[PDB]
């Protein structure tokens, strides 16, 4: 099942052809302006692969930018029409989650997952039937956002997260005790805007401090509020398999603190090792074999979740 | 011959010629372009029993208009013709608006932009379409100056009319005169670029 | 034209929200609201207050730092911009330009003090400064709206 | 509301409005009216999922046109609405042509007839058309006289262009203003008959 | 199976509703000219008595006839199909006439030969065992009806020609004068009458003190000969001894006699109609096709020269 | 009502058919041909020779006395009318007028002379008269279409010795 995947949700424009969900026959990437780039990429694709061979066309229908998404979505439906093959509109967040089961072949369906990135911070349950709902959600800023903006405040380079990671290694966490904004609540939600400003106030007040000490204490604040809410939910839902997806999942402090908690309480924790063009095709293929195709009347929604 | 032409610069406008048969479709409704354009193109092609690979050229409106509309438009065409590299006939939306009017003479076409600004061209339609003033962004005042200067017979403003039959004729014309391009060559008319640059100069003055 | 400045010293969080409500419930369609303020100033929490006027939950107002644009479709549609992480000007040139064609929807722009040239001259400017740990100062510039500044000074006088 | 309008005076023009959705379809080809009008009406009604009984009003072009075209048209409508006695909106085809033009002003509508005779009317199109000269037959020379007298801005000659959207609006308007008729009251515009008599005289 | 039938092929306009067989629920005619003006009226009066939601099939003549006249019923029928969401049947008018032979006599054997003689139609047709039919003989010139009417004119006798010539020939002497039988003694079952018509014209141009009664009878006999020969010859060469006569000129007493005389000799069943109901004829033919589930597409055009 | 007359005398059936062909194959389209002539003058027979020029069989030409109008769809469209039975003028007013708007279809009207006023002024009149039992006379009235006159006079040479 040769599935053609189009990606115009991310900054890179991408077109991928995948056989049976596991074989890259062709993967083209721009390396932004989707409408200018995509036609070039489709050219290059159709020069190498014969059009007749494509079985299903797939593209992201959200979340993302209304304008960025339409180019891929619109193109895919046209391809679908011209090829006379079915079309699959993929949910980007859903696709990310499914890649956990892709990385780990031997993984039980009932799972809890933390998505912590810039502009994405949520807790979601994966059912046995592989359906999923968002249970926890940030009300203010994302965790990644907090990393980036606090790094700025601290006078540290981009990117916020890895820089704060590295400098915090030389610092003492719990030297200073910043607030954990939503911790000890009857909700699984998150807040980070409060934390961010608290750092700023300390930077305005205090004078003698080490940057290493502030960073590590801010990090440990975040990593506390992530770990608690993640394990609390896993507990109240009786799941002991828990997965960490997203950019800030990279954080060595979080990784350590999760591992510690997952040795005491006997839990399996899964982390990532992303490719964009393929991930669309792979999700497409997966839906194609369940015979679940998208209508041609499908609009893009930029705030797609769950 | 077989021609499909479409413009989504405002409303959805589709012309389809199969040999001796011409069919026109327009859509005005609350549904978004992305919800309706592919659905119709699919249905019309099914009903006429026409594979896309059977088409001889596909016209596409590119000219000044709504960004979302033009994007759904162009991208749809990009998808349809990419597997078969079908010659693409780029269609200036305004020019199609002017040509869509029956009467001849001096014609002004205008479309509101950001408040206090307008997309504007003026043409002489007498024999053929002769461009008097090329499409560009103008201030509310500068439009009135242009109206007065050119003393136009026909004014087309805000609610434009595009005849799908005209879209086809032009595609055929463009095909004849060896003026079609590849799907990877299309360059839209983004007049929304100029408007930001003019605001700066006149905001300072 | 030169806007009437309306200063406000030492507002609480809820007072700041209430102001945002008062402003936005009282404007008509197709207005631009420039939010100036540095990190930590209630730029985004102002928009919380704003969404009250379009009869939506505050909960759905979230930072657009990464999302770039949020649209809240209510009694009126609010376009919430955050130019913090903008890399490509053409988004302003094309996408934002296309929104400014909407004649009955409101646009509020976090960090709209960047790219001064772009915005329409009669834009509503809103500046927020940190007073203390729980208070803020805001000065609102509004150009020659007989009905607007009157309804705003009422709450200024309601101090 | 739900409106179906159609004119067969020249080409096949069909407008259909279902709530918030307005579709326009036109045809120009070799295929005759009888073999193409019903086919489209059927599919369009299927696609919008609406039974004829769900129609509020049905507009039909009766105004000056090709006899066999008008016949296919009016008959079709008669068939559709007879089982339900749906309000019928008779549309003047020449009026629909003028109203279909974007520009305003003095508009001449002129179609060819047999050997140097014409169907002709001219209107003023400010807000709605006001008739300057009622539709009637004229000679080749009498048209030219009418042309210079009125100095028309828009001249619609031979290849008359009707937007189905216009047809829908007019029907809606005629329904509102309680000027709709039953299917058994339809009276066409038989402008052709005259030509014979006017030749003699 | 309530089948609505519309007839606008020529002259009088007609609508009928019919049930499974001959179960006439409603039959309206204009006769009791202008189709488009008339048809709506009839459809009104029909729906006043019959609920519209009851009709199962809609059927109308798609030819032969006048392009303009046919289009009115054809188009209306399709519209009725579309609004009622029921199938449509476009009927052949000649096949409808033939069908009504089996309607007029319920116990009739399928394998049948049939002469159709009227103004504007003269043919020989074979009906098969499965009721399919082809035209085996046909007029190349004028119809027998035409010959009758035009010759009656030449004699200065009021319309229609058939009845008049019939009546006046009863007092006249057949084969007083001997006009040709144009197509007789051919290999073919085809007819010509134009040669006979002009012959009479020449005789009247080479005038005498002839009786009109004599000319009429001598012309009539000429026609009834050429009609009898070719009809019986076929029925023979096809091995059928059931032969049916349909059309206006089938009312000719001279033909009736001469057929009956020749069909006493050979044990042959001959079927004439009675000395109408054009709406029902369409409905019947529709129902018949409906039963075999042979329905007409909506893209169906009217052709005036429909036969077979 | 005087125009260019082209007399022919003692034409056999096939000579008359061959003339019909030579007239019609030289027509541009959208012209009316009025056939005058008494009963059995040879009008329908002339239309038999007219159909040769639209590459159809003569067999499908039959008197339309009852059918009112026959339409022969060939290399062109021939509208064969027969106004012998006509009683209601409206048919001319509506049905026949509508057809006259067609610019490239030939119309030939058996017994057209009955309603003399109705026809276009530029009509081709063809009068036929019975010379004898097997021979007929034809005259063709053509006004200003000098093109066709050339081709028709050429026929004369083929009839020179008959
Ligand atoms: N090692 C690390 N430790 C902590 N934070 C890290 C990190 N590596 C990256 N981050 C943070 O993760 C964020 C970027 O995450 P990515 O998932 O790579 C793109 P994103 O913008 O978050 O995607 P999204 O739109 O799906 O949310 C930044 O805020 C960055 O500072
Ligand atoms: N008077 C006041 N007005 C607004 N927020 C106040 C406040 N006093 C305290 N706060 C706190 O300050 C924080 C404001 O956060 P945000 O609204 O995210 C600032 P922002 O300017 O939008 O951030 P950005 O610069 O990262 O875009 C909240 O945690 C809020 O509770
Ligand atoms: N007694 C009679 N003898 C001879 N011919 C007769 C006749 N009565 C009627 N006719 C002829 O019958 C013809 C009229 O037939 P009708 O039945 O009235 C309609 P039709 O011509 O049969 O139509 P159709 O062939 O289209 O079905 C005329 O040609 C008339 O001369
Ligand atoms: N020289 C000749 N040219 C044409 N026909 C001739 C002829 N000599 C004999 N005939 C015969 O004369 C007859 C011509 O009659 P038709 O043309 O069929 C009827 P018509 O003249 O059209 O008048 P109608 O309207 O009364 O039927 C045929 O039988 C034909 O064979
Ligand atoms: C009028 C105001 C000065 C009164 C006071 N600010 C209240 O509270
Ligand atoms: Mg913010
Ligand atoms: Mg004749």
Curated annotation (Swiss-Prot), chain B:
CDD domains: ASKHA_NBD_TsaB (cd24032)
First-listed, main subcellular location of the protein, grouped into a coarse class: cytoplasm
Cellular compartments annotated: Cytoplasm
Domain of life: Bacteria
CC annotations in GO: cytosol
GO biological process: tRNA threonylcarbamoyladenosine modification
Pfam family, one: TsaD
Keyword annotations of the record: Cytoplasm, tRNA processing
Subunit structure: Homodimer. Forms a hexamer composed of two TsaB, TsaD and TsaE trimers.
Biological role stated in the UniProt entry: Required for the formation of a threonylcarbamoyl group on adenosine at position 37 (t(6)A37) in tRNAs that read codons beginning with adenine. Is involved in the transfer of the threonylcarbamoyl moiety of threonylcarbamoyl-AMP (TC-AMP) to the N6 group of A37, together with TsaD and TsaE; this reaction does not require ATP in vitro. TsaB seems to play an indirect role in the t(6)A biosynthesis pathway, possibly in regulating the core enzymatic function of TsaD.
NCBIfam families recorded: T6A_YeaZ
Family statement drawn from the similarity comment of this UniProt entry: Belongs to the KAE1 / TsaD family. TsaB subfamily.
Protein name: tRNA threonylcarbamoyladenosine biosynthesis protein TsaB
Organism whose genome encodes this protein: Thermotoga maritima (strain ATCC 43589 / DSM 3109 / JCM 10099 / NBRC 100826 / MSB8)
Gene giving rise to this polypeptide: tsaB
UniProtKB/Swiss-Prot annotation, chain E:
UniProt KW keywords: Acyltransferase, Cytoplasm, Iron, Metal-binding, Transferase, tRNA processing
Catalytic reaction list: L-threonylcarbamoyladenylate + adenosine(37) in tRNA = N(6)-L-threonylcarbamoyladenosine(37) in tRNA + AMP + H(+)
Binding, Fe cation: 93, 97, 277
Needed cofactors: Fe(2+)
Family of this protein: Belongs to the KAE1 / TsaD family.
GO biological process: tRNA threonylcarbamoyladenosine modification
A matching Pfam family: TsaD
InterPro entries per the UniProt record, alphabetical: ATPase_NBD, Gcp-like_dom, KAE1/TsaD, TsaD
Function of the molecule: Required for the formation of a threonylcarbamoyl group on adenosine at position 37 (t(6)A37) in tRNAs that read codons beginning with adenine. Is involved in the transfer of the threonylcarbamoyl moiety of threonylcarbamoyl-AMP (TC-AMP) to the N6 group of A37, together with TsaE and TsaB. TsaD likely plays a direct catalytic role in this reaction.
Catalytic activity, EC: 2.3.1.234
GO molecular function terms noted in the UniProt entry: iron ion binding; N(6)-L-threonylcarbamoyladenine synthase activity
Major location category of this protein: cytoplasm
Protein name: tRNA N6-adenosine threonylcarbamoyltransferase
Superkingdom as given in the UniProt entry: Bacteria
GO cellular component: cytoplasm
Residues holding substrate: 116-120, 149, 162, 166, 252
Localization (cell): Cytoplasm
């Amino acid at each position: 099942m040769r599935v053609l995947g189009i990606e115009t949700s991310c900054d890179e424009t991408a077109v991928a052809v995948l056989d049976d969900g596991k074989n890259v026959v062709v993967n083209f990437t721009v390396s932004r302006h989707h409408l200018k780039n995509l036609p070039i990429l489709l050219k290059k694709a159709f020069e190498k692969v014969p059009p007749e061979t494509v079985d299903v066309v797939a593209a992201t229908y959200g979340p993302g930018l209304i304008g960025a998404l339409l180019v891929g979505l619109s193109a895919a439906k046209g391809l679908a029409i011209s090829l006379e093959k079915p079309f699959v509109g993929v949910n980007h967040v859903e696709a990310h989650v499914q890649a956990v089961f892709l990385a780990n072949p031997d993984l039980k369906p009932p799972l809890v997952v933390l998505m912590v990135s810039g502009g994405h911070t949520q807790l979601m349950k994966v059912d046995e039937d592989y359906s999923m709902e968002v249970l926890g959600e940030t009300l203010d800023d994302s965790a990644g956002e907090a990393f980036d903006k606090v790094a700025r405040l601290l006078g540290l380079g981009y990117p916020g997260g890895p820089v704060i990671d590295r400098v915090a290694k030389k610092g003492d966490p719990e030297k200073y005790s910043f607030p954990r904004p939503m911790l000890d609540d009857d909700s699984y939600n998150f807040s980070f805007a409060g934390l961010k400003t608290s750092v700023l106030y300390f930077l305005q007040r205090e004078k003698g401090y080490k940057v290493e000490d502030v960073a590590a204490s801010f990090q440990k604040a975040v990593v506390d509020i992530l770990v608690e809410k993640t394990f609390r939910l896993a507990r109240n839902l009786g799941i002991r398999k828990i997965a960490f997806v997203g950019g800030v999942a990279a954080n060595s402090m979080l990784r350590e603190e999760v591992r510690k908690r997952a040795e005491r309480w006997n839990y399996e924790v899964f982390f990532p090792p992303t490719d964009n063009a393929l991930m669309v095709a792979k999700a497409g293929y997966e839906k194609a074999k369940r015979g679940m195709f998208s209508p041609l009347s499908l609009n893009a929604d930029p705030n797609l979740n769950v | 011959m077989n021609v499909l032409a479409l413009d989504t610069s405002q409303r959805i406008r589709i012309g389809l010629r199969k040999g001796e048969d011409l069919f026109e479709i327009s859509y005005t409704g609350e549904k978004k372009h992305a919800e309706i354009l592919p659905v119709v193109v699919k249905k019309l092609l099914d009903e006429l029993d026409l594979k896309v690979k059977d088409l001889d050229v596909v016209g596409v409106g590119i000219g000044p208009g709504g960004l979302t509309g033009l994007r759904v438009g162009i991208a749809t065409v990009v998808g349809l013709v990419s597997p078969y590299d079908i010659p693409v006939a780029p269609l200036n939306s305004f020019e199609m608006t002017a040509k869509s009017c029956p009467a001849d003479g001096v014609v002004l076409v205008a479309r509101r932009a950001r408040k206090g600004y307008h997309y504007c061209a003026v043409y002489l339609k007498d024999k053929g379409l002769n461009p008097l003033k090329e499409p560009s962004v103008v201030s509310d005042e500068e439009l009135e100056e242009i109206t007065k200067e050119f003393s136009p017979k026909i004014v087309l403003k805000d609610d434009l009319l595009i005849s799908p039959a005209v879209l086809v004729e032009e595609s055929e014309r463009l095909f004849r005169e060896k003026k079609t391009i590849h799907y990877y060559e299309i360059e839209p008319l983004y007049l929304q670029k100029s408007i930001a640059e003019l605001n700066w100069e006149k905001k300072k003055r | 034209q030169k806007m009437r400045h309306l200063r406000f010293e030492n507002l609480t969080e809820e007072q700041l929200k209430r102001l945002a409500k008062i402003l936005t419930e009282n404007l008509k369609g197709g207005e631009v609201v420039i939010l100036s303020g540095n990190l930590g100033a209630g730029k985004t929490t102002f928009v919380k207050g704003m969404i009250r006027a379009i009869g939506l939950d505050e909960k759905m107002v979230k930072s657009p730092t990464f999302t770039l644009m949020n649209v809240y479709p209510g009694l009126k549609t609010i376009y919430h911009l955050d130019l913090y992480r903008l890399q490509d000007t053409d988004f302003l040139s094309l996408d934002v330009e296309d929104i400014l064609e909407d004649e009955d929807g409101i646009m509020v722009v976090e960090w709209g003090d960047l790219f001064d040239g772009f915005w329409p001259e009669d834009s509503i400017k809103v500046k927020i400064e940190i007073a203390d740990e729980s208070h803020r100062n805001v000065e609102i510039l509004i150009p020659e709206e007989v009905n607007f500044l009157v309804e705003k000074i009422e709450r200024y006088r309601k101090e």
